Amino acid sequence: PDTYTSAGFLSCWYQTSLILPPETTGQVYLLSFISACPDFKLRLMKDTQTISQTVALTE
Amino acid sequence: GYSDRVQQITLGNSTITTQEAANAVVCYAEWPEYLPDVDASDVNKTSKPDTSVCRFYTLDSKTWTTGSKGWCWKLPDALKDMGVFGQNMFFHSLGRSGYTVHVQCNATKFHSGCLLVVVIPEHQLASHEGGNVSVKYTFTHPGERGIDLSSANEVGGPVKDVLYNMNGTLLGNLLIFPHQFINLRTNNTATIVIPYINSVPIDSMTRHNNVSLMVIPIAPLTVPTGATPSLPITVTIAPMCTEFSGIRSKSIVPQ
Amino acid sequence: GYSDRVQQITLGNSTITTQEAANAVVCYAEWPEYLPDVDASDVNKTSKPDTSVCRFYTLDSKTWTTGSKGWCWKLPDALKDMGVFGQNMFFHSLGRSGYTVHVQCNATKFHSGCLLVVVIPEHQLASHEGGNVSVKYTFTHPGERGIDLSSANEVGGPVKDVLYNMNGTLLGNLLIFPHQFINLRTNNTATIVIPYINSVPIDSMTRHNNVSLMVIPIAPLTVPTGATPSLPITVTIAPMCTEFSGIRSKSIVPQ
Amino acid sequence: TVASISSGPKHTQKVPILTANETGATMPVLPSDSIETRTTYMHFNGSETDVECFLGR
Amino acid sequence: TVASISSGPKHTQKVPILTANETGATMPVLPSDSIETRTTYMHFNGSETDVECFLGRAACVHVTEIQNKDATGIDNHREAKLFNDWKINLSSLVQLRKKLELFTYVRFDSEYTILATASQPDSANYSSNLVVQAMYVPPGAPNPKEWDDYTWQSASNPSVFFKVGDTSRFSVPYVGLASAYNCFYDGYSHDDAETQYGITVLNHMGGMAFRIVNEHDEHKTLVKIRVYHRAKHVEAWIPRAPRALPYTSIGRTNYPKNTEPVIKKRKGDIKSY
Amino acid sequence: TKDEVNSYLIPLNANRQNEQVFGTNLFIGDGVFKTTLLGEIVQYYTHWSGSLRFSLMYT
Amino acid sequence: INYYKDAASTSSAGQSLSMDPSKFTEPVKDLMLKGAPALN
Amino acid sequence: INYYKDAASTSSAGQSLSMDPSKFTEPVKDLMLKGAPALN
C-alpha cells in the first residue's frame, strides 16, 4: 500500500433489485473471483510478508 | 447462438448487458450522427467531448406499484446534472445530442404487468387549468426526478391525466411514436436509440427539451401471492454524438 | 512590414493582439503536442474538449508599485476555476496540457521598470520555517490569486524571499529557465508557449502542479513626475492541446 | 506488442463479458471488451517472473 | 575545428553586437564580431563535461555503523546497532546532491561500492574477521527485527556477503517507477490537507539493511559502513539554477533561517577592481 | 472473526432498491486480495502494472 | 567484452557528442539572425 | 564459454519465453469462444 500509487475503489449496488420466486426465501449469495489480464506486469522480486518463522524446522 | 434477447451496449467507460431484451428501436430508423456542414449555420467550430459526455447515466429509481399511473422525463433536462454532460450544457449557448435510453424492470415468471416505453418528439404539455393557462418552466424541467403522473395537479404545472398523454391525445395512439413494451412475461428491458430531431440544426439545451421519454404501466402489475406488491423501474440514458457550441459564461435558469 | 513587434494569437473563441511584443519563447524549443500512443500507459481513450478548454482565460489583475516584490502562479492551479477547463479538471482522474502565457504591462516613454517573466518546471517551494517543515497544500494552491511575494510569512506556507526563488537558488540564475523580460522602454507584453513537461505521460491535475509562472520586478518601477506611482500587470493564459482521461465522480480537494 | 488496442462504442448481440464460471475456465476478457480504449504497447517481456529466475537466486 | 576565424576591419550597417535581451535569447556573439581576429583551432572536444562524465564517478552517499557484541539481554537489536538499516536515498550527503539538482529529472543505473572498516576502541586481544551481510529490503517485504531473524534468509531479496576491510560492488538497474527520477516534485501524494509536500513521497525506494554474520567474540567491534554511488548510463533533462543556500532536509528545498549573504560584498566601490 | 467458508459469500437481500452490495479499495497486496493467488504472487514483487479482471458468479 | 548478462552491468556510457545549446540559448518562436536588427 | 565439463556446472538457464496459460485457464473439452454464449 502506497498513496501516491493508489488504484481506486470497487463498489456494487442494486440496479433494480433481487426478486425471489414464490416458495423461496432468505439470502442468496454471489461468489467473486480475481485474476490478472494479459496486460499485467510484475517486477523487482522481493520477500513476502506472508510467511516467517522463529526456529528452523526439523523432521 | 446470438439471440435478439442478449445484448451489450458499451459507450464510453460504461457498459450495459441485458439477457432478456426484445430487439431495440432506432427512432425513424435513423442512428444519431454529427451535424454536417451543409446543414450548419452558426460559424463556430463545435466541441465534441466524446467519451466524457457519451457514457451511461443511471437516473434514480422509480417504484411500480399497483397504483402507478406512469412517469415522464424530458431530454436533455433529465441529464442537466450528470457529470460533464451537464456542465457543458450550462456553459455553451447551443448544443445537440442523440441518446441511447435503456429502461430496466425485472420480475419473475409468476408476475404479470406490461409497461409502454415511448419517446415523443416535441411533447408540448397541457395546463390542467384549460383555457390558455401556460405551464411554468420549472414544471417542465423536473430534472432527474421527472414528472410523476400520479402526483397531484400543482399550480402552473401540466395536467397529469394518462388516458390523454398530457396533451389532448389518447394513450392508445402513442404507438405511432418509436416505442417498445416491457411485458414481464417476455422482456425485462426496453432500448431506444434517439437521433437528434429538430427544425433547426442546433438549439439551446435549456429553453427547449426535444423529447420526453415516458414509461406507463398499461397492464397493471400483478405479483404472485404474498409477494411484495411492487417492482423498481430504473432508467439509464447515454448522450451520443454530443456537440456543444458557443461557449461563454454559464447560463442561470429559473429555480 | 511584419515586425517581431506586432502579433496576433487566436485560440478557440478568443484573440490577443500585441503591438509591442519582443518575439515569443517556446520552452525548450518544443511546441505543445498530444500524447502519442508509443508513450501512453493508461488504456483509457482520452477526451479532447478542444476549443471549449483551449481558449484564453485572463486572471485578475495585479498592481506593480514601487514596493512590489513579485508574484507567483502555479499551473494548472491558476486555472482550476476557469470555465469548462476547470470542470474537466475536477472530474477526470488524469489530464495533461500545454499553455500559451501572455503577460501584459503597458506604460509610456517616460516610465522605466523591467519585469522578468519566467516559467519554472517543477518549482518545489521551501518552508520559511527551515528544517523539514512542509508547505501545506492550500499554500501551494493559491488559485487565480497566485502567491504575492511581498505578503507576510504564514504558517504552513512557503518562504517568499525573492533573491532565493522560494527555493534556495539565486534570482540571478532564473535566466536558465525559459523566460522573457518586459522592459517598459522596449516591450509591453511577454509570451511563452509551454509544452507539457513531466516524468510520466499524464498525471493528476490536482495533486501536482507542473510549472510556476513567476513575474518579478527587477529594475524598480519609476514613473514620470507626479504620475501615479503604479501600473497594473495582467496575466492571460490559454490551455493548449488539453486531454483529460479517467472520468468519474469529481475530486474533492482540501479547503 | 500491443497492451491494449483502440476500441470504440459497441451495441451488439455478441457479449464477451457474460460467461459461466461453472465450466472451470477463466475466459480471457480485456479492458477493450467493456470500455472504449486507445492503443498502448507493453514495453515489457515478463523476464523476471520466469521460473528459472524465481527459483534461481 | 576552428576556435576563431580570421576577421578584419568592419564598417557596416549589419551590427551583430546590438541585441534585445528582452526576447529571452542569448545571441551567439563571438570575438570576431567585435575585434579583428586571427585563425586558431580548438584542439578540444568537451569530453569531460559530458553529463555521463559529470555524474559518473563514485561519491560517498552514506555512512552508517553496526557493532558485533553479545545480544544477550538486548531488547532492541536495531537500537543497539546490532544491525542498522538505511532508508536508501541520495540527498543525505551534499556534494553529490548539488550536482544532481542541476537537473530536474535524471535517469541512470547505479553502481554501489560498500567499504566496511572495523574499529576496536577498547582493549581487545585481537582484530576479529567479520563478514558483513547487506540486504536489499524493498518496500513490502519484511523488515528485520533481530540481527538473526528469518528475514536474513533473504531467499527472494538480493543480498551480498563480504568481509570487513574489503569492499563489495554490484550495480542495480534504474528502479524508478516513472520514466526518470524527479529531482524535484511540486506536488503531494494526494489532495490531503496535511500530507507532506516534496519528493519524499515519490522517491520511495525502500531501505537497505546491514548486519555482521559473526557471533560475538569476547571484545566488542565497531564496523562503520560507507556506501559509494556512481551513476552509469546517465540521462538528464531541464537544467535549473544551482543551489545557493545550505540544505536542511532530505527532500525539501528548505534553507535555514538567518542564513548568511551568499553574494560576497565588495571591499570598495562598484568602481573597485 | 475466524476464517470461514462464509467470507467467500457476498450476501444479497430480496427487494432492496438503490442500496450498496459491497465495497473495497484496490490494494491488491493487502486486505481482501491478499490471500488470493493473485494477491499471493504480487507479494513476491515490488511493482505491478496492468488490468485486473473481477467477475461475480450468481448462485 | 561484456561478461554479464544485464545492461545495467556495463561500464559508463561514451560521449554524447550531441551538444545543441539552441533549446536553451535561442528558444524564440521567430528566428533571430545575428546582424539583423533584434526588433523590427 | 563453459570452463567446466559437466552440464550442471553451467550458469542459469535463459528465459523460457514459452508462456501458454491455456492449460490452466481454459482446460475445457469443447472450446469456448469469447462473445459466443457460454452455455448453448
Ligand SMILES: Cc1cc(CCCCCCCOc2ccc(C3=N[C@@H](C)CO3)cc2)on1
Ligand atoms: C545487496 C543489494 C543491495 C542493493 C540495493 C539496490 C539498489 C536500490 C536503490 C535504487 C536507487 O535509489 C535511488 C534513490 C534516489 C534517487 C534520486 N533522488 C533524487 C535526488 C535523485 O535521484 C535515485 C536512486 O541491491 N542488492
